C-alpha cells in the first residue's frame, strides 16, 4: 500500500473510535435519556470501604449505584456490583425501539491485578417488556461475555422479532468466578427506532 | 506491507490506547481504591480566582485538591498545584505491591499557551513506606520528567528491591521554571501485586 492509503485507513479508524468506539447509537445511554428503575433491579453489593467526608467529620460510605452501568466512564471501579453470580438490572430506554443488538463491556484484563477479571459477567440474557413492571417480559437473547475476547463485546440478536420495546432487563446468570460479587461496567442497547 | 497488515497494526495500536494508554494497571488510581492522605503531603497553592455560586449568592472559591493527581481527567487545569518548585504528595495504594515503575504526565505543550509548560515537574523521587506515617521511607528512584518528551512518561526503576509497599511518596524537587507554582496532572504506580 501507499502512504496515502495508510492515512485514510488511520483516519477512518480514528473516526470509528470516536463514535463511542462501536459506532452505534445507544438507546440505554443515561445522558441520552435512559434511566434505571431501581425498585425493579438487584440489590447493590454492600462493602463499607470508601468513606467520604468534608470539613473534618465523617459523612457516609459511598458505593456505586446501578446507574453507572449506563455511564460511559469505564476506568477500574466505575462498575456496579451485586451479591454473587446472578443479578437483575432494568432500564427504561430513551426511546421505544426494536432491539437489534446489545453491548456489554468490562475493564481490560491488562488493567486488572494479576491480569484476571473474575468479577466479569459470563452468561447473560435480555428480556424486553412492553408496559413496564413485572408480568415477565419477552426473552430476546441469551449470550456469553467472553473473558478472553476484547473488553467491548457486541451481541447481535439471532433473528429478532419485530415487536418494539422501551423497557428491558439485563439478567446475569453467572460470572467468571469471583466469590463475592459481579461488577458491571457499561451496558448498551441498540435498535431501530419506532420513528 | 499489505492493507491487511495495516489494519492489524491500527487495531493493536487502538487497543493499547484504550488500555489507559500505557497498558499497565495503576495501583494509584483513585476509583480503583487508591487514596491520598492529606495530613501528610503538601499545602495546595492558594489562588482565589474561581468563584462558584448558586441561586444568586457567592459561596466559595474552589481550588483543585491533591486527589486530582490520581484522577484520569487531564484536560488543562485538571492538576494539583503547590507553592514553588518543591513538594510532598503521599498515596495509600489500592493494594500492597512491589513497585516496579511509575508514571507521571502533564498537559501537552501543544495545548498550552505559547507552547511552553513551565509548571511541569522536573526532577522527582519516589519513596516507599511500609507502615504509613513518617519514619522516612525507602528511596525507590530519582527521575526527571522531560518537558521535551511526550506528555505521558513511564519510568522503570533501575533494579528495584523485592520489598513490597502500600504507601508511597511523590517528592518533586524542582520544576521547569514557573515562578509561582507546580501543577501535577496524574501520577501512576505500577508493580507486581503481593497476591
Amino acid at each position: 500500500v501507499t502512504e496515502e492509503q495508510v492515512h485514510h485507513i488511520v483516519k477512518q479508524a480514528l473516526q470509528r473510535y470516536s463514535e463511542d468506539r462501536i459506532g452505534l447509537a445507544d438507546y440505554a445511554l443515561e445522558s441520552g435519556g435512559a434511566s434505571v428503575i431501581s425498585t425493579r433491579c438487584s440489590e447493590t453489593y454492600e462493602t463499607k470501604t470508601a468513606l467520604l467526608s468534608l470539613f473534618g467529620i465523617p459523612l457516609w460510605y459511598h458505593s456505586q449505584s446501578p446507574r453507572v452501568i449506563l455511564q460511559p466512564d469505564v476506568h477500574p471501579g466505575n462498575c456496579w456490583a451485586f451479591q454473587g453470580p446472578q443479578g437483575f438490572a432494568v432500564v427504561r430506554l430513551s426511546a421505544r425501539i426494536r432491539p437489534t443488538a446489545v453491548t456489554l463491556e468490562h475493564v481490560p484484563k491488562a488493567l486488572s491485578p494479576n491480569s484476571t477479571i473474575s468479577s466479569a459477567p459470563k452468561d447473560f440474557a435480555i428480556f424486553g417488556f412492553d408496559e413496564d413492571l413485572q408480568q415477565e417480559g419477552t426473552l430476546l437473547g441469551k449470550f456469553t461475555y467472553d473473558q478472553d475476547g476484547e473488553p467491548i463485546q457486541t451481541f447481535h440478536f439471532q433473528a429478532p422479532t419485530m415487536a418494539t420495546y422501551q423497557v428491558v432487563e439485563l439478567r446475569i446468570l453467572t460470572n467468571w468466578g469471583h466469590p463475592e460479587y459481579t461488577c458491571i461496567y457499561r451496558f448498551r442497547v441498540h435498535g431501530e427506532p419506532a420513528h | 506491507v499489505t492493507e491487511e497488515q495495516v489494519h492489524h497494526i491500527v487495531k493493536q495500536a487502538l487497543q493499547r490506547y484504550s488500555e489507559d494508554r500505557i497498558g499497565l494497571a495503576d495501583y494509584a488510581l483513585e476509583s480503583g481504591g487508591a487514596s491520598v492522605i492529606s495530613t501528610r503531603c503538601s499545602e495546595t497553592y492558594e489562588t482565589k480566582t474561581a468563584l462558584l455560586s448558586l441561586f444568586g449568592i457567592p459561596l466559595w472559591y474552589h481550588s483543585q485538591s491533591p486527589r486530582v493527581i490520581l484522577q484520569p481527567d487531564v484536560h488543562p487545569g485538571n492538576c494539583w498545584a503547590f507553592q514553588g518548585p518543591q513538594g510532598f504528595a503521599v498515596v495509600r495504594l489500592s493494594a500492597r505491591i512491589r513497585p516496579t515503575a511509575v508514571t507521571l504526565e502533564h498537559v501537552p505543550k501543544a495545548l498550552s499557551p505559547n507552547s511552553t509548560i513551565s509548571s511541569a515537574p522536573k526532577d522527582f523521587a519516589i519513596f516507599g513506606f511500609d507502615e504509613d506515617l513518617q519514619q522516612e521511607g525507602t528511596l525507590l528512584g530519582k527521575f526527571t520528567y522531560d518537558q521535551d518528551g511526550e506528555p505521558i512518561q513511564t519510568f522503570h526503576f533501575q533494579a528495584p528491591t523485592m520489598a513490597t509497599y502500600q504507601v508511597v511518596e511523590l517528592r518533586i524537587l524542582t520544576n521547569w521554571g514557573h515562578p509561582e507554582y507546580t501543577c501535577i496532572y496524574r501520577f501512576r504506580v505500577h508493580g507486581e501485586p503481593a497476591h
Partner: peptide, 14 residues
Amino acid sequence: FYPMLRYTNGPPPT
C-alpha cells in the same frame, strides 16, 4: 465542595 476520600477497608469492587 471539597470532600476528602479514604478507603478504610479494602479496595472497592472492580
